[PDB]
């Protein structure tokens, strides 16, 4: 009642170099599914803001597939669990959870009747299991391959069959129900990463590390041919092929390869039809792909989602973002753009009204970014664990990471504050307070270890939170600071912020407390109420433009909105704001709109009325 999520700029799928990514989809093909963290993302092809998230696995999610009926989703994790849950309601009630084997689930396949599920992976006692979705009842045995089963698929037509690809280089076929081994095929010479039946079940194809794509008769697995690219010698791709998928009408196959291309094939002629290069960088390798009734999507090693135009043979849309923990957020002065940074140094720009993303490239840092701030002139200041404070300019395309000023710091930067106009920047470091005013990086040693910093709107005060449980407030004269007040907290300071009108300074700490101070009154307590509603370390704080409300994000997964005009009132608690994830950054876009970002790679927008 007190708030509502109005938009989500979702996490990209989890990816690992040279590792296949498996996608799922809704019956109509209007949404794709992928995993990151302990979550399952159902991402719409026609919306950049309405992705749905299911977060109930306790272990890292691997693959998720929605049944042909569209009513259930079966998702696996690295532990070997396959949870089958309702997709129709936000409560997502669990139907069944089955421990298929001890180890990671790599692929899942629903039969055409939405009655059976075959799950495969790396398991101690077996590599695959087939069973009933609703009861967990075994519906056969998938014994037959000697190493991890990487891909599995049901024949959608009768007689029923199940095919699988394995690290033992073979493709196996099972007949049923009940299902049992029928044959093995050794056309491949390296790991088989993907096996898929066409829509009518008359044929299936396989591919993998040896770069070839084989076509087979759907009922008995007899090879009918191999795909040819006349520019290559006896291979479909010049590198590993991580996945293939069939067009809805079965006349074409699309493949994703380490060779950095997506290729579309003509099934009838067995010849390549379009070759679509994604890029020339190592991150442009394609690790997964799926063709739905509404879109053909391929995934880059960097997690980017590429929407392919099969007619033109090109890439239509690329959705960027993060798959690593987001650590900082900063919006542009005009409120049209949002910048987000992560734990691996990546930064993305987002158009706030549409959700359209852009990955900053080149990369400003190669490691953790502990802060980023925009200036009324379009620059973006940043600090990272590589002990550098960099200033990215505007020239190349929006923010020119093309090339700009890097300054070594004497100690690691933990926090960053910058004046609106960019005239002054202060970085709170492990052993120093670094001040940046037009070229001169002036460093002031401190006796304690800092943890965060805030600069008053009028540039007169610099508040430095410390690991000594004190907020050190300094008056800033040029490139020098003089401590005018030392505020004591019960535990280490975690974040600080000044209201835009300079009326208040707020500090949060590891004891889960949020404490505001009256600036005009020598930083005395602004009120005496106990703002201890978070149940875990508070990670961030930010003031509303109205200088009265503020918000905090915590490791307890929540965002809490506080009201300075009613300190005894219960605050607004957005519980589970980021499910099973710390909320690392929160900022206000206006007096009733908050944006939060989490360890989960998600960026959420919240409408919070008065
Ligand atoms: Mn299938």
Curated annotation (Swiss-Prot):
Subcellular location field: Cytoplasm, Cytoskeleton
InterPro entries xref list: G-protein_beta_WD-40_rep (IPR020472), WD40/YVTN_repeat-like_dom_sf (IPR015943), WD40_repeat_CS (IPR019775), WD40_repeat_dom_sf (IPR036322), WD40_rpt (IPR001680)
Molecular function in Gene Ontology: actin binding; actin filament binding
GO biological-process terms attached to the record: actin filament depolymerization; locomotion; muscle thin filament assembly; negative regulation of actin filament polymerization; positive regulation of actin filament depolymerization; regulation of locomotion; sarcomere organization; skeletal muscle thin filament assembly
Pfam annotation, one family: WD40
Annotated Gene Ontology cellular component terms: cortical actin cytoskeleton; myofibril; sarcoplasm
Family per similarity comment: Belongs to the WD repeat AIP1 family.
Biological function: Induces disassembly of actin filaments in conjunction with ADF/cofilin family proteins. Regulator of actin organization in myofibrils.
Stated name of the protein: Actin-interacting protein 1
Source organism of the structure: Caenorhabditis elegans
Lineage of source species: Eukaryota, Metazoa, Ecdysozoa, Nematoda, Chromadorea
